[model samples]
Target: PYTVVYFPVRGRCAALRMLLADQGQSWKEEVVTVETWQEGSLKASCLYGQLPKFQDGDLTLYQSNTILRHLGRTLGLYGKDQQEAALVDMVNDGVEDLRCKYISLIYTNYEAGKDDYVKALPGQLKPFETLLSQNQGGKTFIVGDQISFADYNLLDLLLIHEVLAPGCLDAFPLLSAYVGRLSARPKLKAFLASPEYVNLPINGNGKQ
Candidate 1:
């Protein structure tokens, strides 16, 4: 019994949705159209005047990462130990850093900035490749052996980047294989193939 209220686009909700699907948990989506979001009443009610407001039973929350962390903690996706939990946060924070840049390019500067963004993509992606290399020789999860919340977020990040620049992951073998492996998870694979995800634009404004 969870509810996610957001605009029609996947936006920040994609990774959490992936996490839920992979974990075999169900939640209700409350899609807020752009017109509805412009109505001011709902926008005013939002703590941060943002979409992707989440409700877990009676507890309401804002901030995409907060919701992700909540689900991670509650659903046992954080990690095995305290040290691993901190590492998970570290990886998720790096994912957020890149995600913010991707958002800026998509919503504000796609026409003029995409070329340069694509050029700089490899350097931006290298750290992840390095992370994977350090962890179990790039064969296992991003952090430790078990899949954690950060893995889902990083997977979504990589997936959208691939869409933005086809073959962006070509140089990063570990990341390429990681995306392939994570996307092949049974329920996540089915969800990815479903129209619900397949048909949705990666971002709003029809940019990429």
Candidate 2:
């Protein structure tokens, strides 16, 4: 079993917890802060000295993308075929790119620089709407007839907006519908409401 030590933020690790929670796997979250960070010398011995770190027995694991792939593969959360798997990876990468682009506004500049980031979000949104339009028509997910990482990636990104910029999604009808559909999923819904899964966007303090 592995326990995760991360901030209250829902960043890099939400997909992992979402997958694991879907499968009914038991895990623990050790929310760490500056105070707690100094207390855990064992956690500091990592390349980045950052969080979303995984502790399994005596071993410590890092890398967010690697962790998502591990949990997805183990839980059969891939597309049903090889092509689907590749497509799922593609979609996830796209979502990640959008996420970083949005964050870059806040990270590299002053508070006045956000509107441009919001404008550029549609660059990612339009293509996603096209894909999601297909998803709703033919299959249950973005890549296949069943839920896979791509579907979750869509859900995850939508949640990001719903957190950071709530009213921003009014224009993206397909995305809003998709987010509702994904959130209503039995397993994913349960995970979202779980104590192990912290709600984001309420404040600036927590995102993994």
Candidate 3:
């Protein structure tokens, strides 16, 4: 029903993949190889010159966050009400901020900047722990009682950070439990363990 075109690496598509699998939605993945991307034809056609080009029926979309939000809105994962939607946006923006930093570290400066990034990770992660603490003592989802699209993005962020710096969530009790809980979802669990998720590198570069 849906088609996602992206590079072989997970990169920005991990959250959406998790969301689709967890939501029990099926879609086709058009994996682009590095050689194909270097050809420049597909790159020129992309609005943002990015790998993730999503097609939902007649509509096509680029930009990972836009795709995530679109799926969120269409699949009832945005939030319950206006206020909740705003909160979802806020959480997602925070996730994006951290994700950018992560991308920078992984892609540009892994060798030189890793120690600093790891050191500052706790401060970066505190806001999420605080958000979870505010909402039902971290028992429920990130924004509200129901899972929001931001949750998938945030979960992906947390999961990668763990790979970047193992035990990163150990200090944050709520976050530690949150990852465990979310990753245990039946479909998501299977998806995470499957080769589709496991075989791919987290970033384009060889770094974690």
Q: Give lDDT: candidate 3, residue 11.
A: 90
- Candidate 3's residue-wise lDDT over 80-178, tens digit each? 999999999999999999999999998899899999999999999999999999999999899989999999999999999999999999999999999
Writing each residue's lDDT as its tens digit, candidate 1 over 103-178 gives 9999999999999999999999999999999999999899899999999999999999988999999999999999
lDDT of 2 by residue, 29-120 (tens): 88777677777684567667767788667766787776676667767887787888998898888887876775665556526766676666
Cα RMSD for predicted model 3:
0.6
Task: Give model 3's TM-score versus the native structure.
Answer: 0.99
TM-score of each: 0.98, 0.83, 0.99
Name the TM-score of candidate 2: 0.83
Question: Residue pairs in steric clash, candidate 1?
Answer: none
Residue 152, candidate 1: C-alpha displacement in angstroms = 0.6
* Sort by TM-score, top down from the best: 3, 1, 2
Off by over 4 Å in 3: none
RMSD after CA superposition, every candidate: 0.7, 3.0, 0.6
Which candidate, 1 or 2, has the higher TM-score? 1
Ten residues in a row with the worst lDDT in model 2? Answer: 199-208
Model 1 TM-score on a 0 to 1 scale: 0.98
In model 3, the worst 10-residue window by lDDT is 199-208
Output the number of the lDDT-best candidate: 3
